[PDB]
Fold this sequence. Notes:
It is classed as hydrolase. Chain A is mainly α.
Amino acid sequence: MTETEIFAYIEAASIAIGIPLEPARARAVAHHFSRTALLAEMLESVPLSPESELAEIYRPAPFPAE
Amino acid sequence: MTETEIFAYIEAASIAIGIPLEPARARAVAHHFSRTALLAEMLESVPLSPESELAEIYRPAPFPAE
Amino acid sequence: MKTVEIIEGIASGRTSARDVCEEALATIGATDGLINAFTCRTVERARAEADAIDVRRARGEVLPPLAGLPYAVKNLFDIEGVTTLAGSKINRTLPPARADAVLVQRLKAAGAVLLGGLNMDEFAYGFTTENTHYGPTRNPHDTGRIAGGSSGGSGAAIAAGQVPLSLGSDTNGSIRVPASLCGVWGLKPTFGRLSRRGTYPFVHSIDHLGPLADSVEGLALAYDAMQGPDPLDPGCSASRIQPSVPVLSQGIAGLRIGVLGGWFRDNAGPAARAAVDVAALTLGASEVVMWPDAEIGRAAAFVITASEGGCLHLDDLRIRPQDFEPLSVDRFISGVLQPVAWYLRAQRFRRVYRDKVNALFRDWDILIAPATPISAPAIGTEWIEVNGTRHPCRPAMGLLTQPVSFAGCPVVAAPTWPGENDGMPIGVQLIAAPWNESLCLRAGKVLQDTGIARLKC
Amino acid sequence: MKTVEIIEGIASGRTSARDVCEEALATIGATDGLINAFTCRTVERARAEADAIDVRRARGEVLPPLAGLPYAVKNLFDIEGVTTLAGSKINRTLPPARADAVLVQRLKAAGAVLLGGLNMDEFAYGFTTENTHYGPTRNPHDTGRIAGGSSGGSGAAIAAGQVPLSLGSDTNGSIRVPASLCGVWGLKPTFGRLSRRGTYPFVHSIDHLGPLADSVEGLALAYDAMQGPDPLDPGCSASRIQPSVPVLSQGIAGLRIGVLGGWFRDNAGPAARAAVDVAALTLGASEVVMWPDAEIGRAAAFVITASEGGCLHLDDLRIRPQDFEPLSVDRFISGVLQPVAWYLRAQRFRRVYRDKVNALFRDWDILIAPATPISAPAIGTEWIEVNGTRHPCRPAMGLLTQPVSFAGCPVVAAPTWPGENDGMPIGVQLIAAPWNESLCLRAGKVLQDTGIARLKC
Lengths: 66, 66, 457, 457
Ligand SMILES: [Ca+2]
Ligand SMILES: [Ca+2]
């Protein structure tokens, strides 16, 4: 995402979740976010198919002994 | 949490993640999102401590038998 | 012919597997143009599997427990040599499956005969089987009404008499809802009981697989056949087989059975309550019990479902949103855009929820609720009213199912026939603690013996 | 004098536990004005625990294995009757803890004597212990330099000779980094080995707890004392105790030891490489090995950390953002705003990653890397340069630690003293397969025996 797209997202997302950001703080948050966006892009380079599951799947209760 | 805030978030978030949305599609997505936002608010009302953990926590490998 | 008759008829030599197969094929041929349950008919395969059973019988072999029983499967299940559609047009360019789904392998090893693949709401995101690409599946009891969903073909095929057994999936209700609306039997086992390997997923955190059937015996027999560890399946936590068939007729003497109130009565209409009432009377249940945080349970399941389901499809939503099902594509996109805080809070709340449900079942063996708020609405319905309150029709069909699958409790959906309801069925959920499928089945059997739970022509 | 000599002095009656306690108290009093490792001194408690050891000894009892050994803990650990700060101002008004952290309970049962709580980056989000509210903790080897973090007080207290043992936490490097920068020993055990109950968390999916020490024997003794199942702790997977102390001196003959390349050399400066090289030579390691997807491993850990950490603090970020640490509050906020797709992909990638790391360790017993890219920078440093690449100082300190904790592999951080380097230490990670802590410790012991790994006492 471009710097303009990052700015619009930080502003709208921060308002949505209830953490309103003054101009200097929004700029600081965008700086950290932009760095994380690169790391996230790197995640997309590893292929996952729909059956590639989460590392941990729910257990509703321990399986009963016997 | 206003209608105009929801609309700006849908537009910015969809651009951030790479889902192109026409104006009529963004409006349809906002309709569903708004309903989900209420469910999320309800979830927020439940007391959780910092030590209230995720239902599933990572297991690096099975514990060796002996 | 009913399950137990087919099996005994084949076993004793009064009828062949091949003849039973040709009857199911002919019934599909005569009825499915209207019902629209099947998306693929594995005719050659069915005839070969049936002939194989007749050969084993002719050789003097002891036949396996489902020998010659016809069945079919929701088209999210992999069938060898067939492209797995999962209700979509998008999947049609994918390669055909290299192997059957593990559950399909196990039904085959038990002697069951595969007739083909069944229609569903695209990618499992729905409760009505109103598929834009493939057409609606129609309720055999009234073809202007919905079959329920997302396993609509699985319920409708049994109600139309095409097959006695089918397989479906249930994440937030998708087995229990079509069982309820079509008037057939359904079992959603414990989360992590039945192997998910070789199926197209929806929500890794909540998907379950299981059977629908023409009788409670059919549920139990198919369930036992499918049981067993699968170490290659990440979601499976069942370490051994716990047979249900040997104790199916043991009865309910001494069990603590209760009726759910609160959420489960406020979101139940008049017919749904009458069905619970008669099922409760017949099972000796009179105490009203509160399910913990039912509304919040639904909310958390709803949140996790939308984000996990939507993100699973992100690459396609990026390039080809217009090729998805118009009824659900915008729901998948909403899911992708949900704040991560919603997802994490839902996952944290799930731990609390699990603790509360397991604690509740220290005092109860079986708990009873309606499966759907109402009986099947007309195809195309956008809003419903339940006890004077509006709900959107399509999500609302799962109001009573969604809390229970989130805790992973096993459920039998028993078909009942309440009065002043246009002759339409509605189902009752018999819910037990994790791993207590056989108590659900024991209770269903008492309902069946008394004539309270049954199918109709 | 080190852990082993302290213990022996009390055990043999040449010195009382009380006198050893008073010495540590005096040393803290005289040094901590400058070092700023301690945020509270549990004076009354320490004197009572020490006296209790002297009484048991006078009664003729066999003393427990850490009898009279002083220690202190990162202030995210609950101390009975003390408010758990976790490096924040926000937590000051919370009620005091009703009981000790489980690990503190186990050290107490082993006879260890608690001196108090230690400074950290707020809420554990950092690698430098530059705490705006409480002040920086200063590196005892050069008080203009950082102690590392987030367990800075835990490292600094040992390097200053205040205590011989401390406890820290490590999510992405926060034991290994301060061990490296302060020139002391650290152990990050396997994810799920040591009980997290009674601690203030950061990332549920990745937090580990463990000891720092003045010697490898101190690591092993403290680790064995803290070992054991805790069924009330959601994250614990260890079903029994696997003692490290009895085999600590068994050596490394016949083990397959390798040196990590790629990521672990590209992000290592000249001093870091020299430390690895000398540790490799001493341990007989000569094959260069590639860690699978190391950079992506870091990325996924980074993603999950920011969203889990940030969302854990959402209610406070809404109502009192100004009371957070200004150096990390905007990082927490970025975490809350991360798309949910990033989180889910990272969690799905972690499955693949776990498979690849466990497969890698079918061919190796121990793998060697540097603990930090450089030795401690000056307090206040904004940028560092590593092999011609600029990085922000504060995140960059964990480049080499972050991939390894994501897979949950145990690591001993051994302190070494390379020559081209202003006299400052740098540590080396000795990494093993999940559950193989004693191999890490066995390797550290060989490094210590030879004089390669040591403290500057
Ligand atoms: Ca659903
Ligand atoms: Ca960190």
